Amino acid sequence: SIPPEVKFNKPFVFLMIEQNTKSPLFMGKVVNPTQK
Amino acid sequence: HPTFNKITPNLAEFAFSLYRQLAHQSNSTNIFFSPVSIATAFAMLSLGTKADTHDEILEGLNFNLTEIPEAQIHEGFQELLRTLNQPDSQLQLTTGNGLFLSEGLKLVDKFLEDVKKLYHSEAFTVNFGDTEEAKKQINDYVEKGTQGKIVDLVKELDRDTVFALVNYIFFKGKWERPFEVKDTEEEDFHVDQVTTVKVPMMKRLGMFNIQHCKKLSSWVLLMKYLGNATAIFFLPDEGKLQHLENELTHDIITKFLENEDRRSASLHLPKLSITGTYDLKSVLGQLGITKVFSNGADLSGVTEEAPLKLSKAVHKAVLTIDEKGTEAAGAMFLEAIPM
Ligand SMILES: *[C@@H]1O[C@H](CO)[C@@H](O[C@@H]2O[C@H](CO)[C@@H](O[C@@H]3O[C@H](CO[C@H]4O[C@H](CO)[C@@H](O)[C@H](O)[C@@H]4O[C@@H]4O[C@H](CO)[C@@H](O)[C@H](O)[C@H]4NC(C)=O)[C@@H](O)[C@H](O[C@H]4O[C@H](CO)[C@@H](O)[C@H](O)[C@@H]4O)[C@@H]3O)[C@H](O)[C@H]2NC(C)=O)[C@H](O)[C@H]1NC(C)=O
Ligand SMILES: *[C@@H]1O[C@H](CO)[C@@H](O[C@@H]2O[C@H](CO)[C@@H](O)[C@H](O)[C@H]2NC(C)=O)[C@H](O)[C@H]1NC(C)=O
Numbered sequence: 001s002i003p004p005e006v007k008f009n010k011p012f013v014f015l016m017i018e019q020n021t022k023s024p025l026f027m028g029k030v031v032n033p034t035q036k
Numbered sequence: 037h038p039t040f041n042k043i044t045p046n047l048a049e050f051a052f053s054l055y056r057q058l059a060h061q062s063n064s065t066n067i068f069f070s071p072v073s074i075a076t077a078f079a080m081l082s083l084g085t086k087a088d089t090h091d092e093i094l095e096g097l098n099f100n101l102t103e104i105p106e107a108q109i110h111e112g113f114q115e116l117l118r119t120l121n122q123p124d125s126q127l128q129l130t131t132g133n134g135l136f137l138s139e140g141l142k143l144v145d146k147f148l149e150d151v152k153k154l155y156h157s158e159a160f161t162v163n164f165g166d167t168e169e170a171k172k173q174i175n176d177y178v179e180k181g182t183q184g185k186i187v188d189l190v191k192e193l194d195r196d197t198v199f200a201l202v203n204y205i206f207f208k209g210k211w212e213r214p215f216e217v218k219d220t221e222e223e224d225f226h227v228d229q230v231t232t233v234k235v236p237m238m239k240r241l242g243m244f245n246i247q248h249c250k251k252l253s254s255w256v257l258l259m260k261y262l263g264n265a266t267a268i269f270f271l272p273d274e275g276k277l278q279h280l281e282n283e284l285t286h287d288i289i290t291k292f293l294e295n296e297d298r299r300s301a302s303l304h305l306p307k308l309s310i311t312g313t314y315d316l317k318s319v320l321g322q323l324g325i326t327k328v329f330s331n332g333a334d335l336s337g338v339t340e341e342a343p344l345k346l347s348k349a350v351h352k353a354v355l356t357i358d359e360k361g362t363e364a365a366g367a368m369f370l371e372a373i374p375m
């Protein structure tokens with residue numbers, strides 16, 4: 001596909017960062033988004 | 037000049053290293069923490085610590101005491117916390133640190149002053165004889181701070197509790213490049229090789245800060261918030277999930293953060309609500325933090341009346357990502373009892 005298709009349709013890691021300090025606010029891993 | 041980037045890389049490396057412990061626990065469950073909510077709780081505790089048990093804490097947090105004097109780490113934290121609780125005009129972010137102390141306690145008036153100054157902490161007198169009233173009063177603080185997102189932090193409060201150290205963090209910010217709701221459409225998510233979950237998937241076709249590192253074997257997406265926050269997503273190549281996790285290192289993050297080059301792409305990513313609710317004791321154990329959770333524990337920095345120890349280290353965080361942004365909240369709970 002063009003432009004190429006980037007589907008987050010599987011377990012990914014993510015994290016949130018404050019810019020000024022570049023300090024790691026939150027870090028996560030999503031294995032299943034229906035498991036709360 | 038500034039202090040937060042004297043501690044930042046140490047935070048960062050802690051987080052990851054904490055992560056890998058959580059990920060070693062179950063491969064089957066979502067993880068979500070706030071490395072800052074955790075880390076600052078154990079440093080203003082460490083103010084009240086001495087010898088071995090002090091050292092493990094600080095050390096445990098990825099600090100290397102020979103290379104950095106104790107006194108500077110807290111100056112660092114004093115700065116980090118100042119800077120987080122600054123008024124970003126578009127983004128809302130708040131942290132707070134609280135002590136809840138039994139009426140009967142007499143403290144080392146220095147330790148008190150230290151936490152008040154450095155970690156800008158708040159101090160409350162309670163009566164831990166009325167367990168349910170004390171439980172209430174704490175959970176309100178966290179409810180009030182996390183604006184209603186974390187409500188039951190402390191489920192089981194111990195009868196003989198001498199003090200509680202609680203801290204929170206609250207984040208609510210918007211995308212710069214927000215999703216158009218009309219496009220959000222239910223698709224498949226492939227949890228496991230045999231489990232398949234239907235999810236509302238947000239969609240945009242545009243010019244994103246995306247790239248792919250053969251290094252990480254991943255795709256990497258950077259989403260700015262309006263204001264002084266940024267979200268970073270990593271999508272590992274099939275089979276390379278564990279690789280991704282081991283490859284993560286602070287400096288790699290900083291590299292990405294300096295890149296601002298956009299690629300066009302077709303981006304589908306889920307809308308999210310998860311939580312993580314942890315009893316950290318076993319995890320911090322592997323990270324080498326034992327003694328505070330032992331009868332070896334020295335907390336003579338706190339009070340002289342009795343030898344204290346730490347009984348519970350229980351953290352909770354909650355994520356919500358939608359098309360307009362994200363609201364996330366975490367909190368750390370530490371309870372201390374006599375031997
Ligand atoms: C978390 O980590 C886990 C690994 O620790 C990941 O899970 C593992 O994933 C693999 C995927 O390949 C699973 O295997 C599948 O097994 C299906 C058949 O199941 C029977 O036979 C297999 C052995 O062939 C066995 O593992 C099963 O448990 C079950 O048999 C049981 O076996 C034991 C031991 O002999 C026996 O005592 C029991 O009596 C017996 N029966 C019962 C009822 O218990 C296969 O059909 C699957 O094949 C597909 O996938 C293959 C891999 O791609 C592919 O090559 C094939 O062509 C086909 O497409 C598959 O092999 C594992 O069972 C599973 N668990 C473990 C412990 O290994 C998990 O994905 C991960 N989760 C994350 C990251 O989210
Ligand atoms: C502070 O950090 C340094 C660098 O990581 C540590 O020193 C190195 O440690 C490894 C493992 O023991 C040794 O193989 C290296 O030779 C050390 N480097 C040097 C230059 O000596 C150091 O151990 C840390 N401080 C403490 C007290 O552990």
Ligand SMILES: *[C@H]1O[C@H](CO)[C@@H](O[C@@H]2O[C@H](CO)[C@@H](O)[C@H](O)[C@H]2NC(C)=O)[C@H](O)[C@H]1NC(C)=O
Nearest residue numbers: 019020122123124125126127261262263264265
């Ligand atoms: C994110 O943080 C920056 C600081 O890096 C904020 O900018 C400062 O804002 C004040 C006004 O509130 C100015 O008077 C300062 O000069 C600014 N810059 C610096 C370097 O201190 C900024 O407002 C924040 N949010 C956004 C949306 O930019």
